[PDB]
Design an enzyme around this catalytic site. Structure first.
Site, PDB file in Angstrom:
ATOM      1  N   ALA A  66     -10.053 -10.999   8.066  1.00  0.00           N
ATOM      2  CA  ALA A  66     -10.671 -11.923   8.993  1.00  0.00           C
ATOM      3  C   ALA A  66     -11.911 -12.566   8.374  1.00  0.00           C
ATOM      4  O   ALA A  66     -12.240 -13.686   8.727  1.00  0.00           O
ATOM      5  CB  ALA A  66     -11.012 -11.208  10.262  1.00  0.00           C
ATOM      6  N   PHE A  67     -12.597 -11.877   7.456  1.00  0.00           N
ATOM      7  CA  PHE A  67     -13.930 -12.320   7.072  1.00  0.00           C
ATOM      8  C   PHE A  67     -14.042 -12.638   5.593  1.00  0.00           C
ATOM      9  O   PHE A  67     -15.130 -12.955   5.134  1.00  0.00           O
ATOM     10  CB  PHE A  67     -14.951 -11.270   7.505  1.00  0.00           C
ATOM     11  CG  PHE A  67     -14.944 -11.006   8.990  1.00  0.00           C
ATOM     12  CD1 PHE A  67     -14.904 -12.057   9.894  1.00  0.00           C
ATOM     13  CD2 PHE A  67     -14.969  -9.717   9.482  1.00  0.00           C
ATOM     14  CE1 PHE A  67     -14.881 -11.822  11.259  1.00  0.00           C
ATOM     15  CE2 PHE A  67     -14.956  -9.484  10.848  1.00  0.00           C
ATOM     16  CZ  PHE A  67     -14.938 -10.537  11.734  1.00  0.00           C
TER      17      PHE A  67
ATOM     18  N   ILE B 242      -5.150 -12.516  -3.833  1.00  0.00           N
ATOM     19  CA  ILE B 242      -5.062 -11.062  -3.814  1.00  0.00           C
ATOM     20  C   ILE B 242      -4.841 -10.628  -2.381  1.00  0.00           C
ATOM     21  O   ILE B 242      -4.022  -9.770  -2.114  1.00  0.00           O
ATOM     22  CB  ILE B 242      -6.325 -10.399  -4.382  1.00  0.00           C
ATOM     23  CG1 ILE B 242      -6.432 -10.608  -5.889  1.00  0.00           C
ATOM     24  CG2 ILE B 242      -6.370  -8.927  -4.006  1.00  0.00           C
ATOM     25  CD1 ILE B 242      -7.738 -10.140  -6.497  1.00  0.00           C
ATOM     26  N   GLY B 243      -5.596 -11.222  -1.459  1.00  0.00           N
ATOM     27  CA  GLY B 243      -5.329 -11.048  -0.040  1.00  0.00           C
ATOM     28  C   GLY B 243      -6.455 -11.607   0.805  1.00  0.00           C
ATOM     29  O   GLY B 243      -7.410 -12.192   0.285  1.00  0.00           O
TER      30      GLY B 243
ATOM     31  N   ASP C   1     -18.922   0.828   6.889  1.00  0.00           N
ATOM     32  CA  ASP C   1     -17.502   0.548   7.054  1.00  0.00           C
ATOM     33  C   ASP C   1     -16.646   1.301   6.020  1.00  0.00           C
ATOM     34  O   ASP C   1     -15.797   0.706   5.338  1.00  0.00           O
ATOM     35  CB  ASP C   1     -17.205  -0.949   6.964  1.00  0.00           C
ATOM     36  CG  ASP C   1     -15.907  -1.346   7.663  1.00  0.00           C
ATOM     37  OD1 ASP C   1     -15.343  -0.510   8.423  1.00  0.00           O
ATOM     38  OD2 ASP C   1     -15.451  -2.448   7.390  1.00  0.00           O
TER      39      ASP C   1
HETATM   40  C1  XBJ Z   1      -4.168  -4.427  -8.330  1.00  0.00           C
HETATM   41  O1  XBJ Z   1      -3.777  -4.665  -6.977  1.00  0.00           O
HETATM   42  C2  XBJ Z   1      -4.755  -4.950  -6.083  1.00  0.00           C
HETATM   43  C3  XBJ Z   1      -6.068  -5.221  -6.364  1.00  0.00           C
HETATM   44  C4  XBJ Z   1      -6.993  -5.458  -5.319  1.00  0.00           C
HETATM   45  N1  XBJ Z   1      -8.314  -5.716  -5.625  1.00  0.00           N
HETATM   46  C5  XBJ Z   1      -9.133  -5.959  -4.616  1.00  0.00           C
HETATM   47  C6  XBJ Z   1     -10.574  -6.179  -4.874  1.00  0.00           C
HETATM   48  C7  XBJ Z   1     -11.459  -6.496  -3.842  1.00  0.00           C
HETATM   49  C8  XBJ Z   1     -12.800  -6.623  -4.133  1.00  0.00           C
HETATM   50  F1  XBJ Z   1     -13.665  -6.893  -3.126  1.00  0.00           F
HETATM   51  C9  XBJ Z   1     -13.311  -6.471  -5.397  1.00  0.00           C
HETATM   52  C10 XBJ Z   1     -12.441  -6.195  -6.426  1.00  0.00           C
HETATM   53  C11 XBJ Z   1     -11.087  -6.051  -6.163  1.00  0.00           C
HETATM   54  O2  XBJ Z   1     -10.212  -5.802  -7.164  1.00  0.00           O
HETATM   55  N2  XBJ Z   1      -8.793  -5.881  -3.311  1.00  0.00           N
HETATM   56  C12 XBJ Z   1      -7.531  -5.692  -2.983  1.00  0.00           C
HETATM   57  N3  XBJ Z   1      -7.239  -5.644  -1.690  1.00  0.00           N
HETATM   58  C13 XBJ Z   1      -8.286  -5.690  -0.700  1.00  0.00           C
HETATM   59  C14 XBJ Z   1      -9.134  -4.419  -0.595  1.00  0.00           C
HETATM   60  N4  XBJ Z   1      -8.619  -3.698   0.576  1.00  0.00           N
HETATM   61  C15 XBJ Z   1      -8.232  -4.728   1.550  1.00  0.00           C
HETATM   62  C16 XBJ Z   1      -7.675  -5.877   0.712  1.00  0.00           C
HETATM   63  C17 XBJ Z   1      -8.103  -7.266   1.223  1.00  0.00           C
HETATM   64  C18 XBJ Z   1      -7.589  -8.370   0.315  1.00  0.00           C
HETATM   65  C19 XBJ Z   1      -7.688  -7.511   2.664  1.00  0.00           C
HETATM   66  O3  XBJ Z   1      -9.546  -7.337   1.161  1.00  0.00           O
HETATM   67  C20 XBJ Z   1      -6.531  -5.449  -3.988  1.00  0.00           C
HETATM   68  C21 XBJ Z   1      -5.159  -5.208  -3.721  1.00  0.00           C
HETATM   69  C22 XBJ Z   1      -4.283  -4.950  -4.745  1.00  0.00           C
HETATM   70  O4  XBJ Z   1      -2.949  -4.676  -4.622  1.00  0.00           O
HETATM   71  C23 XBJ Z   1      -2.371  -4.872  -3.327  1.00  0.00           C
HETATM   72 MG    MG Z   2     -20.140  -2.618   4.821  1.00  0.00          MG
END
Ligand code: XBJ
Ligand code: MG
Ligand code: MG
Ligand code: NA
EC number: 2.7.11.1
Length: 266
Positions: A19-20, A15-16, A131
């Site tokens: 840094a942490f 998903i992505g 944050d």
């Molecule tokens: C449907 O598309 C997406 C679903 C996502 N779900 C989570 C997600 C994160 C959680 F901690 C818990 C449940 C979740 O679903 N987090 C995403 N991105 C994160 C949140 N903002 C920064 C980015 C990252 C990867 C750098 O942390 C998503 C990005 C998406 O699209 C780009």
């Molecule tokens: Mg926090």
């Protein structure tokens, strides 16, 4: 490939990362249609990543609220940490905002009502997030849209007669007392929220600067801050933003005023 309790994911389904943490999509092993996000250590910052994920478990497992991302399970070990969370199928507010550019007052209101509901629970439990920013606000179409506060790695309990002083957060959203290395309390989160709301309304930060250090110097030199609120802004939203974006935390809106603010009325 990988299992965590009653859940599984593959590292193909990234998903992505930041840094942490690294996040992957996954599912329940019995109920394959139950999607989850699985947050894991980022080994490039191994020690810090492990600490923050452990801190996030400690807080998140105490919070059950429709507008706080749910922790379905977790797994902590000496050299590994996993959080299994509800999948938020809308992504985050930062990507939504980058696309839409600015949001209507009606959308802002709906989002802010939900954030306010989450903040009520945090405040009742004596938790500060530290944050809050659009990247840490997630969107979920369960079919009507829900916002969910995420990323509690910097959160802590703060006893109501005490002050926090750890320098943490993201400079663009940090209350002046935070970035100026002073003591702070739960009202620092209300500044972050003010900044998010301002950014949703206008597409920019209320107080722009080249760098964190320039932003700090700006706040240091400027004893009052007045953000520029567009003339067409409704009076309740103007009032809310001016009260949230008060430089000095003692003058800043408190939680009771925030929760009951006219802008949030249905
Ligand atoms: C449907 O598309 C997406 C679903 C996502 N779900 C989570 C997600 C994160 C959680 F901690 C818990 C449940 C979740 O679903 N987090 C995403 N991105 C994160 C949140 N903002 C920064 C980015 C990252 C990867 C750098 O942390 C998503 C990005 C998406 O699209 C780009
Ligand atoms: Mg926090
Ligand atoms: Mg404060
Ligand atoms: Na608690």
């Amino acid at each position: 490939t990988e299992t965590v309790g009653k859940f599984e994911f593959s590292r193909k389904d990234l998903i992505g990362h930041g840094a942490f943490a690294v996040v992957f999509k996954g599912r329940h092993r019995e109920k394959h249609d139950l999607e989850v996000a699985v947050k894991c250590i980022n080994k490039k910052n191994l020690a810090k990543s492990q600490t923050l994920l452990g801190k996030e478990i400690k807080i998140l497992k105490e919070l059950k609220h429709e507008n706080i991302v749910a922790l379905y399970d977790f797994q902590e070990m000496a050299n590994s940490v996993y959080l299994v969370m509800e999948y938020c199928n809308g992504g985050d507010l930062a990507d939504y905002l980058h696309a839409m550019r600015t949001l209507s007052e009606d959308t802002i209101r709906l989002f802010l009502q939900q954030i306010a509901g989450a903040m009520r629970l945090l405040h009742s439990k004596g938790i500060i997030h530290r944050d809050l920013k659009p990247q840490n606000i997630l969107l979920s179409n369960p079919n009507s849209i829900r916002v969910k506060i995420a990323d509690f790695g910097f959160a802590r309990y703060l006893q109501s007669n005490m002050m926090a002083a750890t320098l943490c957060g993201s400079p663009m959203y940090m209350a002046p007392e935070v970035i100026m290395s002073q003591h702070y309390d739960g009202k620092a989160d209300l500044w972050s929220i003010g900044t998010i709301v301002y950014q949703c309304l206008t597409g920019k930060a209320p107080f722009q600067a080249s760098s964190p250090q320039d932003l700090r110097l700006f706040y240091e030199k400027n004893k009052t801050l007045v953000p520029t609120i567009p003339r067409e802004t409704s009076a309740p939203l103007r009032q809310l933003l001016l009260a949230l974006l008060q430089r000095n935390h003692k003058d800043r809106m408190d939680f009771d005023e925030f929760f009951h603010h006219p802008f949030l009325d249905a």
